[PDB]
């Protein structure tokens, strides 16, 4: 499944940030992110796509100080090509979510839980 693929890529990222000591930025600093609420629909994945820009910069920066993230680019590329499929056929819909404060780790965990909840409904 496509949603199956997205979940994996997120969990892979979370794994790296939890196992590699020098990946400190995604672990220690909070940013204002779009987080998923109880409202859960494939349309809401636009919110995730809007954050992919910033996320690449996070990974690129972490890479430059810790040479343990060589595959930063196509990581985001993989994520982007998977979410665009799930979004469905629609004019891009402005993200309708609240803007909340969290670390990159917490950000991933909440989009992971989002994916897992969809899987349950299908």
């Amino acid at each position, epitope marked *: 499944s496509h949603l199956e693929q997205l979940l994996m890529d997120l*969990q892979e990222l979370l*794994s790296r940030m*939890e*196992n*590699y*000591r020098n990946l400190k930025l995604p672990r*220690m600093l909070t940013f204002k992110f779009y987080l998923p609420k109880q409202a859960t629909e494939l349309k809401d994945l636009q919110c995730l796509e809007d954050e992919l820009g910033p996320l690449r910069h996070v990974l690129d920066l972490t890479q430059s100080k810790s040479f343990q993230l060589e595959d930063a680019e196509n990581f985001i590329s993989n994520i982007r090509v998977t979410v665009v499929k799930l979004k469905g056929s629609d004019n891009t819909f402005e993200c309708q979510f609240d803007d909340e404060s969290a670390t990159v780790v917490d950000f991933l*965990r909440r989009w992971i839980a989002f994916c897992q909840s969809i899987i349950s409904t299908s």
Partner: antibody, heavy 121, light 116 residues
Framework: EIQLQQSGPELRRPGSSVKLSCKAS????????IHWVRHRPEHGLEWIGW????????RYAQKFQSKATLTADTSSNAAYMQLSSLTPEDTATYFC??????????????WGQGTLVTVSS | GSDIVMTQSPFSLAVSEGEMVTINCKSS????????????LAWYQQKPGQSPKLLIY???TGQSGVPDRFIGSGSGTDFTLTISDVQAEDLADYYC?????????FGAGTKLELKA
């Protein structure tokens, strides 16, 4: 050569606090992470949290975020763990351990002799 | 509920000297890293009166000084610890540990006893 010496046994009433110490010798405690893991004979092994003694970063299991506070002192070459709001379920043997590599956070190795903490109603 | 669950079996085991022992660990999630191509799993041994000691990390790689009788195998969600030609000194508790995603979690353990 690498060793982690833990402080002695403790006795506490419920609601109390305890601070355990983990003194490193044979190496500089800054170079690796310090993990804390407890053992309860009926519940097995349970990871509590880790700390990076170089810059002080801490990571906790959600179960212990309010209860526990990890700490290091570079001068003493030592790490510390404090548990507050103790309950009888917190009766355990508390181990400190070191990360295996300097680069990777897990797994833990070179464990201490353990500190027995007994909480009595 | 979010935590990765380690189902370790068997709980207790008694065998004779020289026989082979099989400990199984099953995970609720794959522990394989897609980039590293490694499984984030370790095995610990706790002899009576002693602290836990690392036997095997990354599923199949033995720690220095660990005899060859100890073989870790497996991938994804199914893992196995093997002890061949089991010795009197192997009397201990054995735990699997995952660390693919925090918090790292232990299996319930395996008590191993030896007989003549």
């Amino acid at each position: 050569e690498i060793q982690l010496q833990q402080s002695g046994p403790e006795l506490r009433r419920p609601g109390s606090s305890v601070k355990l110490s983990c003194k490193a010798s044979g190496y500089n405690i800054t170079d690796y992470l310090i993990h804390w893991v407890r053992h309860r004979p009926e519940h097995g092994l349970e990871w509590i949290g880790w700390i990076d003694p170089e810059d002080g970063e801490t990571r906790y299991a959600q179960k212990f975020q309010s209860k526990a506070t990890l700490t290091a002192d570079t001068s003493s070459n030592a790490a510390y763990m404090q548990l507050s709001s103790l309950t009888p379920e917190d009766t355990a043997t508390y181990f400190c351990a070191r990360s295996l590599d300097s680069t990777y956070i897990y797994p833990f190795a070179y464990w201490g002799q353990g500190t027995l903490v007994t909480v009595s109603s | 509920g979010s935590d990765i669950v380690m189902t370790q079996s068997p709980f207790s085991l008694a065998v004779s000297e020289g026989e082979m022992v099989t400990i199984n660990c099953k995970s609720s999630q794959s522990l394989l890293s897609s980039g590293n191509q490694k499984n984030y799993l370790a095995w610990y041994q706790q002899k009576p009166g002693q602290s836990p000691k690392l036997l095997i990390y990354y599923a199949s790689t033995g720690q220095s000084g660990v005899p060859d009788r100890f073989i870790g195998s497996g991938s994804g969600t199914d893992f196995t610890l093997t002890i061949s030609d089991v010795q009197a000194e192997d009397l201990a508790d054995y735990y699997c540990l995952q660390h693919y995603i925090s918090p790292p979690t232990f299996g319930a353990g395996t008590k191993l006893e030896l007989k003549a």
